[PDB]
Amino acid sequence: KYVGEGARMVRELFEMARTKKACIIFFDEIDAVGGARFDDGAGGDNEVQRTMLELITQLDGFDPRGNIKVMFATNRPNTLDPALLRPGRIDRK
């Protein structure tokens, strides 16, 4: 129920992962919080919006993925964030 904590927790994942390498960061049931919902535009709380900003920028650009990995999990593949369906986000399926 706390708004704004999700942006800090995700940022602390990549900062801590650089201390101890050779780790795998797994996410279970991403559709619970959701990658795309109607509360982003219509609602007034910022959670997934700031989560995706820290997820794409921190991992992809300056961080090598050899010793650092991010794996998600879901049920309906068509209900995810369409931003991740674009090339350069999620490849292995």
Place this chain on the structure above:
Amino acid sequence: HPLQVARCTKIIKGEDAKYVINLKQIAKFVVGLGERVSPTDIEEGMRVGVDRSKYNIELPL
């Protein structure tokens, strides 16, 4: 120390060093004029906060 409400009550100083950002629907305020970063105390210390609505230029606290 989690704080989900950052608001003061009838705090007016000066011009400079006033701030008093209120997240409550009544009497919202913003602070311009460049970037201002303080190590500990910005104006009143303590309740100084941001929470869900980011107000202008202040990240650090």
Place this chain on the structure above:
Amino acid sequence: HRRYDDQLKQRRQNIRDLEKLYDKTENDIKALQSIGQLIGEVMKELSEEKYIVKASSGPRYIVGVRNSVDRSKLKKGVRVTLDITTLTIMRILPRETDPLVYNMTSFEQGEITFDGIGGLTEQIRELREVIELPLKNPEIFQRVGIKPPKGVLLYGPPGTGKTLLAKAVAATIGANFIFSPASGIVDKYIGESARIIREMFAYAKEHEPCIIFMDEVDAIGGRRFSEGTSADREIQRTLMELLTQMDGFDNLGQTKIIMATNRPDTLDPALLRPGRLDRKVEIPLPNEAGRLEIFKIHTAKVKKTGEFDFEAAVKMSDGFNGADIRNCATEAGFFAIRDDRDHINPDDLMKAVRKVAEVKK
């Protein structure tokens, strides 16, 4: 001699340039100490020097006048300027809640004259007499005792001639153009479509030179299926308010409202009956002789030569208004770069219209 002459002019110019800047600063700081005022709406008249209003900044408070305040123009629902200290009515303001120049599209005169809408001249002769004539000289009808029509229903295919006729009516007049998009009419709020029509109805009475244009009323209108309501309350909310304002004791003499939809038969038959909407006019495709004047306007802005033939399109054009001919200028604009020319040949007009005639009628 000449050394002090150059410095004399430079010294005088620096004084006059800075004098206008210092005078503005002194005048601005004097207006920064002024005291604000409150705003409220009149509910019911209590007495002469005592009124019962409802303030927008809080609950209701008993108010009054101060000095040189006109009490004849103060009626129920009139927005008044409330004093902070004495709590009295000081200034006089019109009735408005949401901004009608921002949330509602407001425009003056028009950018499209009546010479680009040509081909509709059969309807143009009828529309100008039922709109331009009663608006400029309404007093001619008072001698006979008749009434001019209120609304004008122009239906047809969407996108063809609808944008042109919207600005063409206000261009030959010069009044205000009130645009009412159907998207903002249906929302979820408190008194959404009610305050949109009422404030527009009051803004049309307070300001006579105002023209209201509605686009795609099928969303806010329609018979639906069983005439039942499931999340449909906003459709009947807009339709019932339009019919109630017209048949009331306050009519619109000089105010004209133009509505547009996809089909006339899908609307509410209660509006099509006389007494409210007296104008039902179809918008078919323009004729051949009417499309010649259109092709001499949009193509005039496009750089061309003197040998350009204007009669090449009229044979291959069927119902092509100023909106469809711009697609021909887009293809002709890209051709001038390939041939290293600043103009187009008369043959480019035939090839461009033929491509549009296959997709269109």
Place this chain on the structure above:
Amino acid sequence: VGVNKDSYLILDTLPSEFDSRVKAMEVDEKPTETYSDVGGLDKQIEELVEAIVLPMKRADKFKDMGIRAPKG
């Protein structure tokens, strides 16, 4: 807009940053991409550059001749 709390009067304006822009729509100013990154599309590339990049890249050429640029 600048509004005084005590005086209820506009004094100086305020910088506009968060307007309630309805976020969660990616805004990328001047991205990095080239048509040479993928070959074989030259048939489709020539159609996209002429209908999009051509009326944009040169502003003064189409404005002097009075040619309206397509918006989509």
